[PDB]
């Protein structure tokens, strides 16, 4: 009968790091290893945490590292070994039929346009994202993008973006170790307010060691904002790959289970009864498997 397993805990592929934000001046981004860190300072209005650049600095250097792991369909916990073998066979026919070439191109786009710069991008004058492949320590291959010419809405082809997509593809297929250092320089203005992530004296800001930082899961949600295959009305662009694919800002849950387009019903149709969906929805399913999570009933 091959029912769905009771536990399915997929590990997270595409591990990002906490995005340390340090400040400095534009036109010296090439010497940006001794830049001062953006410190969270108190302000009494109640007291709130604000985080600004220094008054001689217009460029926010947000830097994180990304580990692209591979082994996208193999769970870390699964009860039914027959279901595990059917799921690995399903993911293997996906990969051999069409490799990680749309997913990795979209992840390379979310690295290219600085969507991990969440609110530090909306009024930024010029964003430049430098992605360095770090193999055996130093640099294996260096990328440099204009994150504003590469849009947030459209996934357009480029020459360097295909090489970055092939790197993330080889990392997701298990064919290599991919570790990427992603450095983005946001021209915001002299002493303009930057927005690190927000902890929980009405407001606290996240800071690792006397330096502001965006959370790693926020960077991961920005990297996963690839889902354009959902039922799209109103002109909403890519949303983040979630089961019951939801936006909390808009309060709407696309890919509802009333339609047959959530990750769970698509997975239970693709694995159990072999009803293979369209190539777009199975891209979405494998993107959920790269996201990780706790799948299965209780």
């Amino acid at each position: 009968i091959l029912s769905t397993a009771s536990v399915l805990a997929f590990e997270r592929k595409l591990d990002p790091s906490d995005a340390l934000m340090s400040a400095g001046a534009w036109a010296q981004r090439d010497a940006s290893q001794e830049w001062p860190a953006v410190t969270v300072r108190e302000k009494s209005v109640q007291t709130v945490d604000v985080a600004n650049l220094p008054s001689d600095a217009d460029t926010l250097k947000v830097r994180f590292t990304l580990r692209v792991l591979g082994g996208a369909g193999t769970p870390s916990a699964c009860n039914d070994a027959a279901y595990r073998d059917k799921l690995l066979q399903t993911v293997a026919t996906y990969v051999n039929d069409q490799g990680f070439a749309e997913l990795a191109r979209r992840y390379a786009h979310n690295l290219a346009n600085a969507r991990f710069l969440w609110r530090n991008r909306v009024g930024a004058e010029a964003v430049e994202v430098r992605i360095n492949h770090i193999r055996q320590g130093e640099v294996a291959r260096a990328w440099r993008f204009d994150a504003l010419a590469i849009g947030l809405r459209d996934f357009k082809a480029d020459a360097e973006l295909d090489a970055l997509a092939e790197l993330i593809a080889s990392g997701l297929s298990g064919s290599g170790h991919v570790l990427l250092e992603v450095v983005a320089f946001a021209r915001i203005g002299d002493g303009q307010e930057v927005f690190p992530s927000q902890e929980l004296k009405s407001k606290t800001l996240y800071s690792v060691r006397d330096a502001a930082a965006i959370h790693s899961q926020k960077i991961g949600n920005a990297l996963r904002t690839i889902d354009t295959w959902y039922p799209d009305e109103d002109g909403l662009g890519p949303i983040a790959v979630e089961p019951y694919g939801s936006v909390t800002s808009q309060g709407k849950a696309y890919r509802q289970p009333k339609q047959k387009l959530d990750f769970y019903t698509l997975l239970d149709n693709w694995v159990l009864r072999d009803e293979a969906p369209a190539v777009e929805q199975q891209h979405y399913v494998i993107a959920n498997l790269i996201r990780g999570g706790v799948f299965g009933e209780a």
Binding site: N52, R119, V122, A126, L152, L236, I239, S249
Partner: protein, 187 residues
């Protein structure tokens, strides 16, 4: 002022429309102080007076050449994936006119107390006897949340749409695109 350009906010998974509207308002302010003059005004065609919302449209009223100047300037750089632009087109007619003015209120009694102490050399107790806490007025108006660049303070810029009027008068506009006498067509 017979030309207009609708800047409609795209829906965004990451941002509410009020946040993008305040960012667009600040960018338009920077474009207007870079521009000069007093002949460029704004309006909010999706205004909802019941919930005091500004909607998802911002209509920039100007001449044709001023809009052709502003559509190429770098104030829209970095915003073009949260906006959609029309063309500078002529206005319809007949359209009633209304006033888009900023409304400020004495919403902090302690700032008035500090001004009274600076202007009459009084103490804090004379100030609290003179300016009680029942002077705090809260406006039920739509607003954009702006951060200044000369000072470093974050303020709410309350925009009130005036009563509808058949025929406009001559008048200028502030560099926030609001009215210091000018009127805009409404449609």
């Amino acid at each position: 002022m017979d030309h207009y350009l609708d800047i409609r906010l795209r829906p965004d998974p990451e941002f509410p429309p009020a946040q993008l509207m305040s960012v667009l308002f600040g960018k338009l302010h920077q474009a207007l102080v870079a521009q000069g003059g007093d002949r460029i005004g704004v309006s909010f065609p999706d205004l909802d007076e019941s919930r005091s919302r500004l909607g998802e449209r911002l209509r920039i009223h100007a001449s044709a050449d001023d809009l052709r100047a502003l559509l190429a300037r770098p104030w829209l750089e970095g915003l073009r994936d949260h906006l959609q632009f029309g063309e500078p087109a002529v206005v319809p007619h007949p359209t009633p006119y209304r006033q888009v003015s900023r409304v400020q209120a004495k919403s902090n009694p302690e700032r008035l107390r500090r001004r009274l102490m600076r202007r009459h050399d009084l103490s804090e107790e004379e100030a609290r006897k003179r300016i009680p806490d029942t002077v705090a007025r809260a406006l039920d108006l739509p607003f954009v949340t702006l951060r200044s660049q000369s000072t470093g303070q974050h303020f709410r810029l309350f925009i009130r749409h005036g009563p509808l009027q058949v025929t406009a008068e001559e008048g200028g506009f502030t560099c926030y695109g609001l009215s210091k006498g000018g009127f805009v067509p409404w449609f």
